[PDB]
Design brief:
The structure is cut from a larger assembly and holds two copies of chain A, two copies of chain B, two copies of chain C and two copies of chain D (108 residues). In chain A, 67% of the residues lie in helices and 4% in strands. Chain A is mainly α and 95 residues long. In chain A, α2 (27-53) crosses α3 (62-71). Chain C has 87 residues and is mainly alpha-helical. In chain C, 53% of the residues lie in helices and 2% in strands. The longest helix of chain C is centred in the middle third of the chain and has 25 residues, at 36-60. Classes of the chains: A mainly alpha (95), B mainly alpha (99), C mainly alpha (87), D mainly alpha (108). β1 of chain G pairs parallel with β2 (51-52) of chain H.
């Protein structure tokens, strides 16, 4: 038993879309297990508080977007949101 | 008669050597035997998972180096080259880890 | 044995060359004769504020072992989150 | 019948489902919209795309084809936009950036 | 004349009148308290919510606020602080 | 049925009633222990009574009945042990603790 | 004669007062230029967060809350104006 | 009130401030600067000089970590 859950597969794939030859050793894969779990909590943090701040009740697409510009610095905020808006519209395109 | 390097040049070799590699620096076995000793009075008969004795080592040493780096500006900022104890007291003071 | 432990002189575990390598990694060309006894104060003081938070996790969950999944969680409090052991 | 992955539905490599599972179980909010978890995957898709891609360049630029943490710190310390995001962490086994101050050089 | 704003104005007001029966408290020097209490409160509960998330336990019980209070508070205040609860819970349980 | 507040039952002034709600609705967990808010009430008590009794003392040093944002900042910083709870907080109109390095003062 | 980049509106004597409160004895002549840099960095961030909430909350008025919060993110909470 | 209404103007257009919030910044800027000078002196006195110089603000801002 002892099923422990992680992102060991997904990171390895997104490596392949960007590099089909480079393999990633486990140590430098335990980090990316830590790194995603870090950013996921950090972004979800301010994701929640806005819903709390405005006295809303539900995280949605919007209260995530106004969380990315706070946390990720520089033009990443401008790159990522573009990779977010096209994500939902594609999603709602096949909804 | 025997060849000798000038003072200081052997150090610069290391500064380009140790900054290149990425192994640990503090001797392993004594550093664990410190953690048991210091942790001895927080609780009785503690058993450290040996995965989490190194986990301090890769987390305290990336803090000393974050210190010796940071005094090195100050000793530079005082027209000197060597770091001295009076330097660290400053260095920890701006961060807020002693005052 | 079933008693006693290593509880003396270990703070001298960090010998003079042992710290020297550290200072070399930082990039210090020349080292003073008195720095050694000072960091040994600094180094131990920091270690107190990590184990004392580390142990307090274990005592709560009624364990008797500190797991890396906790020294990571103690460190996360003090800013120094530590990738590569958990998450 | 004929179920298909929401990750595939939006064309996202990351798991759309699991993220939506940590938006309830974590108690980040009482209710989560159908739109947020998709967005949080894609950003994570983008954000872990650039930390990896840049690392992959450096390791190949050190003739090694497998990423090891020393190859992984160089992609975050040398990338100015990310360095402000990992400013606190200390990647295990990471090494440090090669840097000697100018005053430290010998007289010549 | 509606939408009651909520604050700890009245509660900080009482506990003033027990360690200083004479002192009067300014208005702004009570906005600080109405922020410092909401501050420490959130830094505690929001830190308890981590312990009942790591330990897979789906509730916050007195133990959790009894270590979180032992963690955040620096050194000596831990010794007195948990004393104020322990007697509080016992007195609460002695007449629950 | 005759009612008395839990605040009376635990010998406490901060509202174990109200603090209980902000846990339930503050999204800190699905379920909050019945003995949880009371313990949170007292630990605030010791953390509100501690500053003021230090703060009221600085009021006497100014011979002022009214307690002033100046005094709190004065009270919260001298006490070395309470400092480390508020190392990175700035209080409105607080001013600064009067201190001057010994070198700036003339030798004679 | 006020139509200029208002950063000079943080006049030099004002800078001097702060350093006194900070316990600075002798202030160099060039500090008056670099400080107007630092303060220009700092407000560049805190307002950057501050507008984002307001733009989010459909409010065209940046309010006292939406600057207490923005200061909270930088790890400099500001007691007094709300909470 | 005429400085911030200008910096904010570049982040978005037509920002009507609330008169209390302008005070809120006005406390932080003073609170941020005052602490910096206090630590600045520590570097100056560490230089054995007694006057601060712009090369000390830039040093005392890299030790804290704001420089990056």
């Amino acid at each position: 038993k002892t099923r422990k859950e992680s992102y060991a597969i997904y990171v390895y794939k997104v490596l392949k879309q960007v590099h089909p030859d480079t393999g990633i050793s486990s140590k430098a894969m335990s980090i990316m297990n830590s790194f995603v779990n870090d950013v996921f909590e950090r972004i979800a943090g301010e994701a929640s508080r806005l819903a709390h701040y405005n006295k809303r009740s539900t995280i949605t697409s919007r209260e995530i977007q106004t969380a990315v510009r706070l946390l990720l610095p520089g033009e990443l905020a401008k790159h990522a949101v573009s990779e977010g808006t096209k994500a939902v519209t594609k999603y709602t395109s096949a909804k | 008669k025997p060849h000798r390097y000038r003072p200081g040049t052997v150090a610069l070799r290391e500064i380009r050597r140790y900054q290149k590699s990425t192994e640990l620096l503090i001797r392993k076995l004594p550093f664990q035997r410190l953690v048991r000793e210091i942790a001895q009075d927080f609780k009785t008969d503690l058993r450290f998972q040996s995965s989490a004795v190194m986990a301090l080592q890769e987390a305290s040493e990336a803090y000393l180096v974050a210190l010796f780096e940071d005094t090195n500006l100050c000793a530079i900022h005082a027209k000197r080259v060597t770091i001295m104890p009076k330097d660290i007291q400053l260095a920890r003071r701006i961060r807020g880890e002693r005052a | 044995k079933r008693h006693r432990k290593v509880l003396r002189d270990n703070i001298q575990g960090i010998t003079k060359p042992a710290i020297r390598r550290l200072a070399r990694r930082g990039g210090v060309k020349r080292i003073s004769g008195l720095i050694y006894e000072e960091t040994r104060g600094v180094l131990k003081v920091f270690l107190e504020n990590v184990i004392r938070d580390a142990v307090t996790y274990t005592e709560h969950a009624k364990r008797k072992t500190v797991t890396a999944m906790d020294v990571v969680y103690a460190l996360k409090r003090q800013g120094r989150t530590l990738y590569g052991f958990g998450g | 019948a004929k179920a298909k992955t929401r990750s595939s539905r939006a064309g996202l490599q990351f798991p759309v489902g699991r993220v939506h599972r940590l938006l309830r179980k974590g108690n980040y909010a009482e209710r989560v919209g159908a739109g947020a978890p998709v967005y949080l995957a894609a950003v994570l898709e983008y954000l872990t795309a650039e930390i990896l891609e840049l690392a992959g360049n450096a390791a190949r630029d050190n003739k090694k084809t497998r990423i090891i943490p020393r190859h992984l710190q160089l992609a975050v310390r040398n990338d100015e936009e990310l360095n402000k995001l990992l400013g606190r962490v200390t990647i295990a086994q990471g090494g440090v950036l090669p840097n000697i101050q100018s005053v430290l050089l010998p007289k010549c």
